[PDB]
Design a protein around this ligand. Structure first.
Ligand SMILES: N[C@@H](Cc1c[nH]c2ccccc12)C(=O)O
Ligand SMILES: N[C@@H](Cc1c[nH]c2ccccc12)C(=O)O
Ligand SMILES: [Mg+2]
Ligand SMILES: [Mg+2]
Ligand SMILES: [Mg+2]
Lengths: 265, 265
């Protein structure tokens, strides 16, 4: 029932988990589409193409163009959108959506898109690609799929901000105590549910099978993305980084609280 | 095993079959992602928003921005990409890929993207959207999903150029006699296989259920996109328009053959 014009429907743990489940499908679809192309080392080589006045990889350059264009139509006014190039965005040409306040004022500074870009290129691309290879005529196709994947993974991971804020407002006296202690381990314990995480991993295995296998053949019955690769993407990267976002958000949460935490400290 | 650097592997009717089948997954995935948003009438209303120096809908404006950016990196030098705005593209900033010749010289002139935009907006959007209504904070999200859908559908329909050229080269003598005699029905009969059409259709219904139903919930099983809507999309629009591309390609095929056609004359 998530409605970003109604904060109470966004800061609802049941609505949040339902959206997270739906994001599993989105991410799996995007990886399956990226599995159409080879490892494509040229996409991720720094300045392989001497694009004038630009420094970086081809993927970074194509991502920068999309981000710049999407900033013109307010994509990063949304609280569930976190840009990879926050300093290079331009003023939108459409008037503001004017979202209600949901997250604390500093929330845009919680940005781990650099670590996402790093593990996506170094760990995921080699594992979801259909093979090792570099086809010049698929430079653009592969990098567009990369962008789709990168933006779905970044949305999922930075959704931890909504998880953290909803958890904060359900139990302010506990979290005020933890934040003033800087009890990083305590914060992690308060947000972690290992049993739920294992059941996410198991549902991902079945989604990779059901979405990644053509349902017309039962003679070449392999999934076009390895299910354990999908499960490992969450276990090793997406879930730990979501918690880092949540922890970093809470550690600064008293910056945007009334000094009536003198009551609870 | 299509290698667009190898013409013999592209004009392989078996290789074309597999690529069209792989495109079924891509289209179903995109419609499934579009089904997250409402019918969004504001996206498709002409000149609704205050966008300088432009006449059209917001979707058309956003699609134009993308096509212009992608043309800078040679997307429409590819013979399997057909632009929606062919007269508004920009000069590429990268040197060309240099594709070998696969299709006839006039191939870029057969372009049914106007028809695709029309039936997508008028017939597909209302049937896949989660409901009727506008949601201002999802104008961007819904338009981007539309663009993914439109580009996947356009690529599938304009793939009929490769189909026609592959058929033409498999049995030349047959087709010239037909093209010489302006028999659109005889050409239509030679390229139509109704039995395979019913088979891709039955596969689509199964694909819609496998990709659109959360497999952890496989009593109330509700697909994200109605299986009958995906079937009717191919039956009423995609298949007929692909054949239209094929006939219009073959009807002009003699423009790119030396006049030793006089043999078959
Ligand atoms: N596959 C071709 C054409 C293409 C498809 N989508 C693209 C997006 C961007 C650039 C190019 C493309 C290429 O990579 O060049
Ligand atoms: N949902 C918001 C933010 C957003 C997400 N993806 C987008 C893509 C383009 C533009 C905006 C967005 C909007 O449509 O405004
Ligand atoms: Mg997607
Ligand atoms: Mg090659
Ligand atoms: Mg897609």
């Amino acid at each position: 029932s998530m409605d970003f014009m109604k904060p109470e429907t966004v800061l609802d743990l049941a609505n949040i988990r339902q959206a997270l489940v739906r994001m599993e499908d989105t991410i799996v679809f995007d990886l399956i589409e990226r599995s159409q192309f080879f490892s494509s080392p040229s996409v991720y080589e720094k300045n392989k193409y001497n694009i004038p006045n630009f420094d970086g990889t081809f993927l970074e350059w194509a991502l920068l163009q999309l981000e710049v264009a999407h900033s013109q139509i307010r994509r990063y006014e949304a609280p569930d959108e976190t840009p990879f190039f926050p300093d290079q965005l331009k003023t939108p040409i459409l008037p503001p959506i004017n979202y209600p306040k949901i997250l604390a004022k500093y929330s845009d500074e919680i940005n781990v898109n650099s670590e996402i870009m790093k593990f996506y290129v170094d760990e995921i691309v080699p594992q979801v690609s259909c093979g090792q290879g570099d086809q010049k005529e698929n430079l653009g196709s592969a990098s567009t799929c990369d962008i789709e994947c990168l933006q779905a993974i970044s949305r999922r991971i930075h959704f931890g901000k909504f998880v953290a804020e909803a958890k904060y407002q359900s139990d302010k006296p506990l979290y005020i105590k933890l934040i003033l202690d800087k009890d990083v381990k305590g914060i992690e314990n308060s947000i972690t549910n290992s049993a739920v995480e294992q059941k996410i991993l198991e549902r991902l295995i079945v989604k990779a099978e059901s979405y990644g296998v053509d349902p017309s053949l039962k003679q070449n019955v392999q999934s076009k993305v390895k299910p354990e690769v999908i499960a490992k993407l969450y276990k090793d990267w997406i879930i730990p980084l979501t918690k880092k976002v949540e922890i970093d958000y809470l550690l600064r949460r008293l910056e945007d609280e009334d000094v009536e935490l003198v009551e609870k400290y």
